[PDB]
Design a protein around this nucleic acid. Structure first.
Ligand SMILES: [Mg+2]
Ligand SMILES: [Mg+2]
Ligand SMILES: [Mg+2]
Ligand SMILES: [Mg+2]
Ligand SMILES: [Mg+2]
Ligand SMILES: [Mg+2]
Ligand SMILES: [Mg+2]
Ligand SMILES: [Mg+2]
Ligand SMILES: [Mg+2]
Lengths: 206, 127, 99, 151, 100, 79, 114
RNA sequence: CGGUCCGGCCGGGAACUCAAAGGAGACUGCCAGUGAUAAACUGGAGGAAGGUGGGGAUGACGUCAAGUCAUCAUGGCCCUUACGACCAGGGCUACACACGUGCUACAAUGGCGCAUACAAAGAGAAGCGACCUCGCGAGAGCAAGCGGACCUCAUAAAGUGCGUCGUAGUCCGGAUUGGAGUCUGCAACUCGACUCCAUGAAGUCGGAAUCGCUAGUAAUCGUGGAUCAGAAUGCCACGGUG
């Protein structure tokens, strides 16, 4: 059947928001489009920079973007070389002054978005989907994941009839709200269509 | 010192104060007869003063907010009984038997998506 | 006279933790502190259709809880005013100063 | 009622005479969840019935109820494609519940000026056993004695 | 929606603040004052000569990313589909699946 | 139907009614303005009112004053 | 009883008895009895000929019965000769005010036929 | 309690109603019967709550090449001085009909007139808009408070008390149409809502057949909201009686 978003259902239980700011009905829409526009710029620019998560908070009349990345060195640059050029245009998009924070993603093979983006970038290089899935699973399980599940949908390997294939190793309790389930998506834009990647990583309870 | 007992049923909330002497009933600065236009709603507040004897033994200053006629009346019934145990505590046995100590947890069920009411489902058509 | 602080936040375990900071900072620097007064939460409910096309009964129901806190400080001591003004509070909490 | 073996809800007695059987009767008459206007029709019909029959408001109801009260009824059962009517002895609780239901339904089908008048004249017809309500017990009787072989 | 349909809305906004915000509002309140000019105003006639797209009522509320004219919510400025997509990623603050 | 505070008329059509009075009656007045209220200064003229495809010519009468020009130009073909 | 337009009002209450005339509803009947100085909850019995003619003179002010029927009919025919949308629908026996014709329009069309 | 313009309204009181953060509590735990001494069920005690206490959220592997290339994204195909683009007017609202979902009815458990008791949950600055005044009215003019447990939308209606109608196509029922208007909007002819006056269709309880609902449910009675310049009998939500 149809499943509930594992990140969405756990918001407030064991999962945090990607937008912490407060606003009234007046500027809630204006801030939400500004949030979309700032994420859009940074995902496009820091595509090779391995960006996993983007957190936006608005202290008074300012913007505080916290870029979660597996490669902070390429994001920061030569003694703030790349942070300064990003902050300069984030302040232009948002209107209010900008402050960018860089959070280091230690074990990226345990991050749903980075695992999904790795499978997506691999499928576009013409790698075998089964090899890409098995490697994603093995890498996660050997690094301490209590359980993992990776799903790839549509025209697999260039095939005419679309299939939905998945690998699962360990425990993946999607019904336990207490459970830490990191869920994310990624789309592989191949020469023969769009292949959707879905990754579930169980890290433990509480 | 005044003997107090809180009583509630549905969205109604009633506060009951007990002081000995006479058989007076004042609800929101009004009389028992002036507030309730139904005698069935008048008899339910008289119910705790049947098993536990009172004709002119004790007075009651009562105030109720929210709900409706039977809601407010039912809430006061629960309050008198709670103020009655506050005064003795040996009256618990008689009040349990009549079922006045129990808070009636029956609230109106929410309207659900896809349904015309709380449970009423829209008319089905095969073809 | 009296300084009225009105706190607004979508998260509850963030509003009363930022409120505790305001109450403590004021009562430590010697002021008369009324509250934390818990004012009613405005539950903005939203019902969106979960299917891109057709399927009218299938829906998603969400809410935005807007928690309210009222802190009234009676003594406007220079030791209290300056202590509260240079306080680092949570970025997701709105502070309304009423003179 | 396939697996779950439920009991029966014990309703509060009558606010006037303290009768549980009358509390069942007011609810049977009651429409659109209007209990206030429901007991108002039942008390006005009882006031006009006992006055025009020789008092005893509880007993005048009982005389009219004893004539409509059925002893046996048919139960629809399909065994081999064919639908057989099996005669079954009704329980004392349902005995009164069917008796009261036919009194209300026959008074509703009457052409009098008010429901307090329609009910009183139906309870008067039932006390002397010559109405639409006693005939519903009569048709239920002729149906039971006919299929007496499949008992 | 279409790029042309999105562009048509930018024009309807730019013309809404140019005229019917500081000029056409002045001649509409004038076409309501009973005390002054009951026949010789021409304000109803000069309102016509102003562009059509300048009226604020002629503007349609569309999903700020896709351009969807249906299923809109002013609170988020997005359509019900893109509201759900951002709500599940936690991109909408304080918004979570409610039950009561 | 509308507020008594001035009946409505299009300026491009109102100027066409003015030009037709002083210069004398011409051929049917080709106009798309169906929303305009008929004034007494129109009685006798031939206004070609659009229906969606062709311009329906309607001879203006005294009883036609107050009504809209689009009432005398059927929009939907039904046979 | 006999008032204005030949009709013979029943021996019911004054306000309901006056609604029998074509051109006088609930409001006109309440205003006619208020102007003539007569009660609304009084029957035709006790209402002498001196109280009847004062109501006849009162009701004579507004167009009623046959005089009103031709006035309604004249405005219907006016729209028809004009050639307007409003008139073309009184001529075709279909809803004039704008109501849907795809379904439910049986009051103006009349009962259906296969 | 002190003071009364008899209004929590003002000093005050933190008792209580309530508001909202944390915490306790219910587990067949106890007792008895049934049952393979088991599981479990039944009944009872205590308890605000008893056997997943009430309601929701939560929808396994998969099934129907089921729905959506018109939310968006997209392999391929097709148009590219046109299948693109701008504009006015029209159409999506047509009407011999048929089916599905609803609203309102057919009435005295009801219609009408006056008097009157009791809610819950929401919305609000390009906004909700009081009080006052004008109009029979929809509204209009003037103009406080309120970004809101403070102010406003907003009088809850069923119900109750009295009076009337008295089984009548009616003081039921409101369709349809005529006349005059109100507001929003550049603009209400096609094709808006609402008001005032008049009109007063069908319908007196629905064939074959068929649907919902097991308790604060059905039935009924009002209230709010999203979209929205304006446009709800739909939808989403709320309590009253029951
Ligand atoms: Mg596009
Ligand atoms: Mg619009
Ligand atoms: Mg009449
Ligand atoms: Mg709690
Ligand atoms: Mg579960
Ligand atoms: Mg198909
Ligand atoms: Mg299809
Ligand atoms: Mg009527
Ligand atoms: Mg069930």
């Amino acid at each position: 059947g149809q499943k509930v978003h594992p990140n969405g259902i756990r918001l407030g239980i064991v999962k945090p928001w990607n937008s912490t700011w407060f606003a009234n009905t007046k500027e809630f829409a204006d801030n939400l489009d500004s949030d979309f526009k700032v994420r859009q710029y940074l995902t496009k620019e820091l595509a090779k920079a391995s960006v996993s998560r983007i957190v936006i908070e608005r202290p008074a009349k300012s913007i505080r973007v916290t870029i979660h990345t597996a490669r902070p060195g390429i994001v920061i640059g030569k003694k703030g070389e790349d942070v300064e050029k990003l902050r300069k245009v984030v302040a232009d998009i948002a209107g209010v002054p900008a402050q960018i924070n860089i959070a280091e993603v230690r074990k990226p093979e345990l991050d749903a978005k980075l695992v999904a983006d790795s499978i997506t970038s691999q499928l576009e290089r013409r790698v075998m989907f089964r090899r890409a899935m098995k490697r994603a699973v093995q890498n996660a399980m050997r690094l301490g994941a209590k359980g993992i599940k990776v799903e790839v949908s549509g025209r697999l390997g260039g095939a005419e009839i679309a299939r939905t294939e998945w690998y699962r190793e360990g425990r993946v309790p999607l019904h336990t709200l207490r459970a830490d389930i990191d869920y994310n998506t990624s789309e592989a834009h191949t020469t023969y269509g769009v292949i959707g990647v879905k990754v579930w990583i169980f890290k433990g309870e509480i | 010192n005044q003997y107090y007992g809180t009583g509630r049923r549905k969205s109604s909330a009633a506060r009951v104060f007990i002081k000995p002497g006479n058989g007076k009933i004042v609800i929101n600065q009004r009389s028992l007869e002036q507030y309730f236009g139904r005698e069935t709603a008048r008899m339910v507040v008289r119910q705790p003063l049947e098993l536990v004897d009172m004709v002119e033994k004790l007075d009651l200053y009562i105030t109720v907010k929210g709900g409706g006629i039977s809601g407010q009346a039912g809430a006061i019934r629960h309050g008198i009984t709670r103020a009655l145990m506050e005064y003795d505590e040996s009256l618990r046995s008689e009040l349990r038997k009549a079922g006045f100590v129990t808070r009636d947890a029956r609230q109106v069920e929410r309207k659900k998506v896809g349904l015309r009411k709380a449970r009423r489902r829209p008319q089905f058509s095969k073809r | 006279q009296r300084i009225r602080i009105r706190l607004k936040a979508f998260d509850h375990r963030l509003i009363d933790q930022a409120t505790a900071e305001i109450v403590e900072t004021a009562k430590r620097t010697g002021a008369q502190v009324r509250g934390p007064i818990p004012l009613p939460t405005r539950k903005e409910r939203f019902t969106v259709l979960i299917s891109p096309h057709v399927n009218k009964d299938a829906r998603d129901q969400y809410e935005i809880r807007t928690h309210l806190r009222l802190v009234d400080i009676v003594e406007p001591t220079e030791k209290t005013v300056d202590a509260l003004m240079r306080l680092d509070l949570a970025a997701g909490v709105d502070v309304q100063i009423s003179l | 009622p396939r697996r779950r073996v439920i009991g029966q809800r014990k309703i509060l007695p009558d606010p006037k005479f303290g009768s549980e059987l009358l509390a069942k009767f007011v609810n049977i008459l009651m429409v659109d969840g209007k209990k206030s206007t429901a007991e108002s029709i039942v008390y006005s019909a009882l006031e006009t019935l006992a006055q025009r029959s020789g008092k005893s408001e509880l007993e005048a109801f009982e005389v009219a109820l004893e004539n409509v009260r059925p002893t046996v009824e048919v139960k629809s059962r399909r065994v081999g494609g064919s639908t057989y009517q099996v005669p079954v002895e009704v329980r004392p609780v349902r005995r009164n519940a069917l008796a009261m239901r036919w009194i209300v339904e026959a008074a509703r089908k009457r052409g009098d000026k008010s429901m307090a008048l329609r009910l009183a004249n139906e309870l008067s017809d039932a006390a002397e056993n010559k109405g639409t309500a006693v005939k519903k017990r009569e048709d239920v009787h002729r149906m039971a004695e006919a299929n007496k072989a499949f008992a | 929606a279409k790029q042309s349909m999105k562009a048509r809305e930018v024009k309807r906004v730019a013309l809404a603040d140019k005229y019917f915000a500081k000029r056409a509002e002045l001649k509409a309140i004038i076409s309501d004052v009973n005390a002054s000019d009951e026949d010789r105003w021409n304000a109803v006639l000069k309102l016509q000569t102003l562009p059509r797209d300048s009226s604020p009522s002629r503007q349609r509320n569309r999903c700020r990313q896709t351009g969807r004219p249906h299923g809109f919510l002013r609170k988020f400025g997005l359509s019900r589909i893109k509201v759900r997509e951002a709500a599940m990623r936690g991109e909408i603050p304080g918004l979570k699946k409610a039950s009561w | 139907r509308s507020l008594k505070k001035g009946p409505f008329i299009d300026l491009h059509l109102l100027k066409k009614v003015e030009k037709a009075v002083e210069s004398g009656d011409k051929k049917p007045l080709r106009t798309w303005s169906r929303r305009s209220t008929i004034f007494p200064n129109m009685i006798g003229l031939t206004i070609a009112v659009h229906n969606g495809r062709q311009h329906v010519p309607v001879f203006v009468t005294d009883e036609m004053v107050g009504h809209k020009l689009g009432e005398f130009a059927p929009t939907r073909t039904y046979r | 009883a006999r008032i204005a337009g030949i009709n013979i009002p029943d021996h019911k209450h004054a306000v309901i008895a006056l609604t029998s005339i074509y051109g006088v509803g609930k409001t006109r009947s309440k205003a006619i009895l208020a102007a003539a100085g007569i009660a609304e909850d009084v029957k035709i019995s006790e209402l002498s000929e001196g109280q009847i003619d004062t109501l006849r003179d009162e009701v004579a002010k507004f167009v009623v019965e046959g005089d009103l029927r031709r006035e309604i009919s004249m405005s219907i025919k006016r729209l028809m000769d004009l050639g307007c949308y409003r008139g073309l629908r009184h001529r075709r026996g279909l809803p004039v005010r704008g109501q849907r014709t795809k379904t439910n329009a049986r009051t103006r069309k009349g009962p259906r036929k296969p």
